[PDB]
Design a protein around this nucleic acid. Structure first.
Lengths: 80, 55, 138, 69, 88, 101
RNA sequence: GUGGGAGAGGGUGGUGGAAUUCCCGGAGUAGCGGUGAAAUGCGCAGAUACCGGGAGGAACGCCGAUGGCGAAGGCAGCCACCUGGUCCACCCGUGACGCUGAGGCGCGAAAGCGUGGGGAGCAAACCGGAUUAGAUACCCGGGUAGUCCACGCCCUAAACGAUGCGCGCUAGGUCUCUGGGUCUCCUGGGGGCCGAAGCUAACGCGUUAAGCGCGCCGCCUGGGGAGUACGGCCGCAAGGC
């Protein structure tokens, strides 16, 4: 944490869109919005970063696929 | 479509999934935000930095 | 009206195990407990616990799945592929020692309520007793 | 606007409260639907029953004529 | 309509013990009272086929409870049947 | 015994003599049928939305009464015998369901 | 059991308005009516359109809903009475008293029959006109049975959700009707719409299953012949099983 919380990572969608299979990650519901348990985010993030670093050091290629509106620029800049 | 294509060819999947997603289709998952430019920025910057450093 | 409890328990286990849920709740009884203990000892379920739901005694069954699969449909392989009820109310099935069936060449099991308790087919043949044929599981 | 909105507190079951019940009728002596009134199903039902009762008493018109084309 | 007072008198009359409202005797007595009222009503109103279904359901329920009571405790069954004047 | 409301719409073209006469007649019939009045409201004359008995006016009488249910019907058929009474409405006393709370 | 709720659920008495028809009164003239176009028809014995006073029969305009109630068939002007089912809360009483149910008993749209009444409008059959190789039909003007009420029969249907009943288990989202609560919203019941798993030949169904199971009942075994013939039972008959 201490970076995730300020970045608004732990903000989900309303109760009108949540996929039931995602329920294992949700901490609690506030003011009609779904909040993600940042702790589980921490362990999962550690796991995924470990995998990413291992694959990169092995020389593997990772493809970035984000085609939303706002995500275009960030994806381009990061991938380049 | 991308995720289904990656599944079909036995390619690992990493996603920045949020509340309205199915975690099963993703092998390595980051439960966080997909809106909120700041969240995307943090996650992607960290990942790219880790890529660069561990080369 | 609930006519068969044991079929109910088996169906509860099945329906649960297929939406890949983690635990399940079933009303408690001695006979159900015997069947559950046989299932657990055979490495079919993670194990059973005695709990209380609003005072009512219930049994919580913890369920076992395989490793996560690769490619499309990555849902883990089932440990209980198929679980039936042989002897139902309105048609009771009893077998001698000679008539004890073999399930999937021994890869599966069949549970009997022999005169010496609830036993798998293997133990019942070893002891040399028969009785009601409850269920087949593999 | 909506008739309920352009009103204060009142009692629907009063079958003699003419000065308000006159508002829930069109130019022709017909009960206004929930589109024009803006009431719940229950309120609308009670209102229709009350209007019918008042019409029986002769307080309200069964039918009228609009002075137009 | 069956008044609160009549219901209460029946309950207090057929109670197994003071403060009982659920014993077989109480239920059978209440059913008997309902059956009586509905029976006379249907005697007057002949073409009321809808209430006849209610009557049949009531009679069936009473018979089921009486069967249970007779199976369990015969003395109470005979006492109740004589007290209420059923089947006679 | 239950609680009821009684509405009488009678001839407007009755003077004091006939008005008090008919009032006494209906009242006498009221205690005849075991009724028990809690309050009386007179609304004088109000304009009807359509003619009743060839006249556009009517005199309104309102009585919140209390009487056994079984007689109520009979009571109504008694209040309608007078030629001067145009409308009789007996309504079980409902509850003030307050709209727009 | 106690405290409450909703509703075109049923039966029996009454009374409210707007039409249609007929009778009469006031005037008031030359056509009304009808069709794709026209006639048949009504009118000069005063038709039609207007106003006023009567009689009578049947159905309830707005509300009105993709809504509610009932086991179905079905049920809506308003008021009162006598009653059936159902839901919620309190978990207060009894102690497995339960589910299904071949026969039996009862209810069962419309049409049809019997004994009486009633008859405004519509209208099988029937009588004319028109369209037409022919219309014995569709369109038009009349018109009995019938449609309405009481009692008694008949017992059928695309009587449909083309889906028997009871119970338990298995993601959700959304729109409504109706209750209780601490009322941002949680918690029961009912009616719909998308859709997880799963099912299905497919269409599609999917917590109101056509999913996973259990208990009981009823049916099916190629299409015609044929719901026919025969025998039986039920009906006044048509006819039904």
């Amino acid at each position: 944490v201490k970076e995730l919380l300020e970045a608004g990572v732990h903000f989900g969608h309303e109760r009108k869109r949540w996929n039931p299979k995602f329920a294992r990650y949700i901490y609690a519901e506030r003011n009609g919005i779904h909040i993600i348990d940042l702790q589980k985010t921490m362990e999962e993030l550690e796991r995924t970063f470990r995998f990413i670093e291992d694959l990169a050091m092995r020389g593997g290629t990772i493809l970035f696929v984000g085609t939303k509106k706002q995500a275009q620029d960030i994806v381009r800049m990061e991938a380049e | 479509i991308a995720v289904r294509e990656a599944r079909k060819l036995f390619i690992p999947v990493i996603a920045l999934a949020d509340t309205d997603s199915d975690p099963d289709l993703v092998d390595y998952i980051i439960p966080g935000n997909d809106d909120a430019i700041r969240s995307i920025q943090l996650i992607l910057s960290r990942a790219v930095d880790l890529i660069i450093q561990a080369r | 009206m609930l006519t068969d409890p044991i079929a109910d328990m088996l169906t509860r286990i099945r329906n649960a195990t297929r939406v890949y849920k983690e635990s399940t709740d079933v009303p408690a009884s001695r006979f159900k407990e015997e069947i559950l203990r046989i299932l657990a000892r055979e490495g079919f379920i993670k194990g059973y616990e005695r709990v209380d739901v609003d005072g009512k005694p219930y049994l919580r069954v913890y369920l076992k799945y395989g490793p996560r699969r690769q490619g499309p449909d990555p849902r883990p392989e089932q440990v209980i592929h198929h679980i039936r009820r042989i002897s139902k109310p309105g048609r009771r099935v009893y077998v001698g020692v000679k008539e004890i069936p073999r399930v999937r060449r021994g890869l599966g099991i069949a549970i009997l309520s022999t005169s010496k308790g609830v036993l798998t087919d293997r133990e019942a043949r070893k002891l040399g007793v028969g009785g009601e044929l409850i269920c087949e599981v593999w | 606007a909506k008739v309920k909105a352009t009103l204060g507190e009142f009692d629907l079951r009063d079958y003699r409260n003419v000065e308000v019940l006159k508002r829930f009728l069109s130019e022709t002596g017909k009960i206004l639907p929930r589109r024009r009134t803006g009431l719940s199903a229950k309120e609308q039902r009670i209102l229709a029953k009350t209007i019918k009762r008042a019409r029986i008493l002769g307080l309200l018109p069964f039918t009228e004529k609009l002075v137009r084309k | 309509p069956i008044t609160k007072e009549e219901k209460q008198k029946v309950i207090q009359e057929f109670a197994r013990f003071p403060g009982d409202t659920g014993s077989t005797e109480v239920q059978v007595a209440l059913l008997t009272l309902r059956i009586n009222r509905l029976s006379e009503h249907l005697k007057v109103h002949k073409k009321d086929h809808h209430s006849h279904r209610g009557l049949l359901m009531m009679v069936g329920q009473r018979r089921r409870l009486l069967r249970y009571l007779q199976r369990e405790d015969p003395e109470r069954y005979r006492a109740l049947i004589e007290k209420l004047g059923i089947r006679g | 015994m239950r609680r009821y409301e009684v509405n009488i719409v009678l001839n407007p073209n009755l003077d004091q003599s006939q008005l008090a006469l008919e009032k006494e007649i209906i009242q006498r019939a009221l205690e005849n049928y075991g009724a028990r009045v809690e309050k009386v409201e007179e609304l004088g004359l109000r304009r009807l939305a359509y003619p009743i008995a060839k006249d556009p006016q009517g005199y309104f009488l309102w009585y919140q009464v209390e009487m056994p249910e079984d007689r109520v019907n009979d009571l109504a058929r008694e209040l309608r015998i007078r030629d001067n009474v145009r409308r009789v409405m007996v309504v079980k006393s409902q509850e003030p369901f307050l709209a727009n709370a």
